[PDB]
């Protein structure tokens, strides 16, 4: 599964600065979804990849940003 990284408390996406390959997004995605996750910077937001199918990504059902 793929999707925008989301702050589980605020419902916000995670903003990044350098488009494309991005170690910030990579590490934040892994920190959230686990060591198998990938991630890169897309339109200045962190887009996570290789997520387990049940993973919760942006947007949060309950919480709007």
């Amino acid at each position, epitope marked *: 599964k793929e999707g925008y990284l989301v*702050d589980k408390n*605020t419902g*916000c*996406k*995670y*903003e*990044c*600065l*350098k*488009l494309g390959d*991005n170690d*910030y*997004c990579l*590490r*934040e995605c892994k920190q959230q979804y686990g060591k198998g996750a990938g991630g890169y*910077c897309y*339109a*200045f*937001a962190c887009w996570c990849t290789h997520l387990y199918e049940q993973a919760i990504v942006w947007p949060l059902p309950n919480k709007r940003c």
Partner: antibody
Amino acid sequence: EVQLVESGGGLVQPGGSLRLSCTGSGFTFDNYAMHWLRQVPGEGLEWVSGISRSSGDIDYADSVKGRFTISRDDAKKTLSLQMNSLRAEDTAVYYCARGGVGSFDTWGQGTMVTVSS
Amino acid sequence: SEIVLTQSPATLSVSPGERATLSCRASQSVRSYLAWYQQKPGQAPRLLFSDASNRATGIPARFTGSGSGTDFTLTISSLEPEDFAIYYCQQYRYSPRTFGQGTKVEIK
């Protein structure tokens, strides 16, 4: 309400240095990417530099790379921009802005920076 | 080569109560990654829309953004006096992020 307040602007000669600071209030400062942009009076907008949450991702406009250094102090809720080797064309109002994930969703009132001999 | 945003017209002369239609054309597709700002005389920019159509908080209903790809518009359905300002578009599909040259909406 979400507010940003810039300081540290002023007049210097070419080759001089300034340190801009921005203090944020009314929001959780450490939860947002923060940016500096600038606007020559009477002219358009230009993004200058920006820094992600946790200072994990940092970038600069090509025209200021090697000369400007951005940093943040989350405890103090401050963003800083050390501007060295200032040039005439760096003259502008400098704005601090909160990142809106692509856009810039909140802007300070700006601080004037003049570089002139 | 960076994305060029062409805003037209450069100036738009209109009467209060009237409708204003501002155009932003991108040199190539920016999908929906386009923001609009208003800058009133003697003030800092103010975000109006992001993702082309998403209203920022406190922006009156009379403002709407639309479009995708290369052609975007900002529409003000019925101009209030405070609506007379400069308006900028800004893309964020690519780096460097770029702005249009602005459209001034002024009294007729």
